[PDB]
Amino acid sequence: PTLISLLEVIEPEVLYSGYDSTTSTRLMSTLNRLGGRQVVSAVKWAKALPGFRNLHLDDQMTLLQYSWMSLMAFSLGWRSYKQSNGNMLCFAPDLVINEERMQLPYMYDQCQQMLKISSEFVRLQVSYDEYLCMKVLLLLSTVPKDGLKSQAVFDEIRMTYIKELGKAIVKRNWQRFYQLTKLLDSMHEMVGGLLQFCFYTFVNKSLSVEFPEMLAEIISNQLPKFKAGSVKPLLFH
Amino acid sequence: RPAILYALLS
Numbered sequence: 306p307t308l309i310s311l312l313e314v315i316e317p318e319v320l321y322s323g324y325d326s327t328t329s330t331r332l333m334s335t336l337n338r339l340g341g342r343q344v345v346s347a348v349k350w351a352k353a354l355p356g357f358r359n360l361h362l363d364d365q366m367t368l369l370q371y372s373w374m375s376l377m378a379f380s381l382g383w384r385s386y387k388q389s390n391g392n393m394l395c396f397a398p399d400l401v402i403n404e405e406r407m408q409l410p411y412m413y414d415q416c417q418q419m420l421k422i423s424s425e426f427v428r429l430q431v432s433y434d435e436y437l438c439m440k441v442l443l444l445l446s447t448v449p450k451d452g453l454k455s456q457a458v459f460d461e462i463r464m465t466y467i468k469e470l471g472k473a474i475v476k477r478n479w480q481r482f483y484q485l486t487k488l489l490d491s492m493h494e495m496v497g498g499l500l501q502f503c504f505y506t507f508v509n510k511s512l513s514v515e516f517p518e519m520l521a522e523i524i525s526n527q528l529p530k531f532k533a534g535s536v537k538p539l540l541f542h
Numbered sequence: 543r544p545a546i547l548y549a550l551l552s
């Protein structure tokens with residue numbers, strides 16, 4: 306039973322937004338609603354990561370808390386790549402963001418950078434096995450500045466998943482590896498933008514943007530810790 | 543500290 310095929314089976318299928326595509330604020334207040342469920346599904350995916358359950362409770366709370374946006378963003382890139390060849394933002398099959406709702410206020414800004422991730426997938430022609438393998442890493446790419454409460458366990462699991470990207474790349478070695486680790490690095494760079502934009506809409510209550518209790522709790526915790534800056538991303542460069 | 547997230551892994 307092959308790891309890479311096993312990844313293929315657990316990867317979440319895409320949620321629908323179930324949206325009435327007939328306002329700059331509903332549009333955001335929908336995406337958060339959706340997002341909350343995605344995070345649910347990404348947690349079930351998390352539990353069903355080989356070796357993930359190896360990690361200690363806190364660390365799991367943490368890795369998810371820290372990389373959650375990242376994974377969400379990454380996969381949105383994948384969708385937008387496979388679905389419109391980089392052309393629109395595809396959140397769910399019903400909710401496609403074209404150039405018309407990009408002109409929706411507030412909104413141009415954050416969405417360029419969601420398309421820029423996808424742009425990376427375009428330029429690089431990433432295969433599916435590759436995608437899966439990297440995403441596993443994003444989960445293990447964002448960690449506290451002050452160690453991890455199972456640092457040895459981690460380092461092993463993280464390595465496992467790299468050797469795994471090795472196999473995945475070989476299937477399609479070692480001039481290409483560079484490029485993708487440069488992309489795995491530049492995620493923390495580009496996600497850090499969305500996370501900000503996220504915290505804005507969150508605490509500036511006078512924008513009447515809604516986030517489901519799921520997202521609510523994770524952000525309200527994750528917010529102060531990230532604001533001071535207790536977070537070091539594991540890079541390759 | 544996040545309630546739902548927790549009850550997931552616990």
Ligand SMILES: C[C@H](CCC(=O)NCCC[N+](C)(C)CCCS(=O)(=O)[O-])[C@H]1CC[C@H]2[C@@H]3[C@H](O)C[C@@H]4C[C@H](O)CC[C@]4(C)[C@H]3C[C@H](O)[C@]12C
Nearest residue numbers: 460461463464467468470471472474475476478479480482
């Ligand atoms: C990526 C490089 C180069 C070696 C390699 O093997 N790279 C692929 C070549 C081409 N193929 C993939 C097709 C292999 C063909 C052989 S085949 O088996 O397919 O016949 C890999 C291979 C072995 C790796 C070290 C060890 O891991 C352990 C340790 C992990 C730590 O975190 C950081 C330090 C250290 C020493 C690692 C550094 C680096 O990360 C190395 C040199």
Ligand SMILES: C[C@@H]1C[C@H]2[C@@H]3CCC4=CC(=O)C=C[C@]4(C)[C@@]3(F)[C@@H](O)C[C@]2(C)[C@@]1(O)C(=O)CO
Nearest residue numbers: 333336337340377378381396415499502503506
């Ligand atoms: C610009 C930020 C980044 C946005 C997120 C980008 C990543 C993402 C992918 C999805 O497919 C579903 C929801 C999310 C997780 C998201 F789209 C929404 O939840 C809204 C979001 C946080 C944001 O729009 C807000 O902070 C608005 O509240």
